[PDB]
């Protein structure tokens, strides 16, 4: 059984060690036309390995022994009532136990507390696993930026944008 | 007729007073599918009227023969992805269609090359067909959008379209 709280300074090491790295046999391929964009899930072989290089809050999911099993960092922009999920990670050995949903429910709580109109996140097109998890939690594609990762370690990837009403 | 320079503190009043408002007979309509987005230019009738609500930031001003600010562009460089963002570009009504827009974008391109940018990038509302057509002519293409960006704003019902070009 897992419990939730606001992250504390002593959690910083455990949070950094839940690093987000993953292997995927699928990516969301972006086809650019002059008049629009198509997202299509596509097989890759060999599997792709991805390693990552007041209105803010970080929540931590905690096991019975007090160990951080996941976290979410969120930020509110009053201008458009957007709660951004800046990061959400569940430790690999603690997946499929509802922690992801629980951290997103804490994000939804902060949203309602601030009077947000929608949840929003950025996810790289190669992160098919996270995209599938977000789809199941009720997020849909609201856009993308094919240029965001130009001149970065992630060049060749596209930033996909997902939202849901609060 | 028009010259360009870096904005000075005394220009702030003239820049704020420049009216970016426009009338359009067309909008770029955004169709959302589960698997993508289509942009299609479409007629609106009657015409839509739209009113708008440190070393790596710069504002340029276009100046008429009498020294009056006729247009401006605010730009910002992010070294992380080598992006020069055109944050704002506005030409005063009655100085439009005289090459000021191109001239301000050329100054943006100069700042890009000075900072070693890889691309120019801008946000434009889907209803701003005139600016979109001008950006297409200057060499920009659609690199994305955010259909949720204007939720809870005066612009709700519009979509943010994203355009880029290599430097
Ligand atoms: C982009 C903008 C600044 C251009 O203003 P401008 O000074 O009249 O533009 P220029 O005269 O430099 O023209 C630039 C190019 O775009 C073209 N262009 C401008 N409007 C066009 C239109 N509606 N259809 C087709 N081409 C168009 C020009 O003909 C020119 O191409 P050319 O060199 O082949 O002739 C325009 O958006 C504007 O009038 N500003 C109003 C404010 C605004 O739209 N704000 C931006 C949203 S934040
Ligand atoms: N859920 C967040 C997320 O996906 N993070 C990305 C993630 O860390 C890496 O992306 C891949 N593809 O690995 C990384 C590329 O090296 O880009 C991150 N995205 C960013 N960082 C930018 C700056 O904070 C400011 N301006 C932006 O617009 C932000 N966008
Ligand atoms: N060329 C710039 C531009 O298009 N400006 C828009 C413009 O001023 C209005 O939009 C329409 N459609 O009128 C306005 C809402 O009404 O939103 C602006 N866009 C923004 N402002 C946000 C903040 O700066 C911080 N974070 C963002 O992500 C920015 N996005």
Residue numbers in the entry:
A (entry chain A): 8 to 60, 73 to 185
B (entry chain B): 8 to 60, 72 to 185
Question: What do the study's own words say?
Answer:
One site could accommodate glycine and the other glycinothricin or glycylthricin.
We then determined the structures of SttE in complex with ST-F or glycylthricin with CoA, of which crystals were packed in space group P1 and P212121 and determined at resolutions of 2.42 and 2.36 Å, respectively. The structure of SttE revealed a single core domain of a general control non-derepressible 5 (GCN5)-related N-acetyltransferase (GNAT) architecture, which is composed of seven extended β-strands and three α-helices. Both the extended strand β7 and β-hairpin between αA and β2 establish the substantial protein interface promoting protein dimerization, where D164 specifically interacts with R101 and W139 via electrostatic interactions. The AcCoA donor sits astride the fork with the acyl head facing the sidechain of the glycylthricin acceptor. The AcCoA binding site is composed of β4, αB, β5 and αC. Glycylthricin, on the other hand, is held by interacting residues (K75, F59, P60, D63, G54, W98, E105, D106, E141, T143, L167, Y168, S173 and E176), which as a whole define the ST binding site. In brief, residues D63, E141 interact with the guanidino group of streptolidine lactam by three H-bonds, while residues S176 and E176 associate the carbamoylated D-gulosamine with two H-bonds. D106 appears to be the base deprotonating the β-amine group for the acetylation modification to take place, while it is a bit far away from the terminal amine group of 4. Its nucleophilicity, nonetheless, may well be enhanced by two mainchain oxo groups (E105 and E141), thus accounting for the equivalent activity of SttE towards 4 and 7.
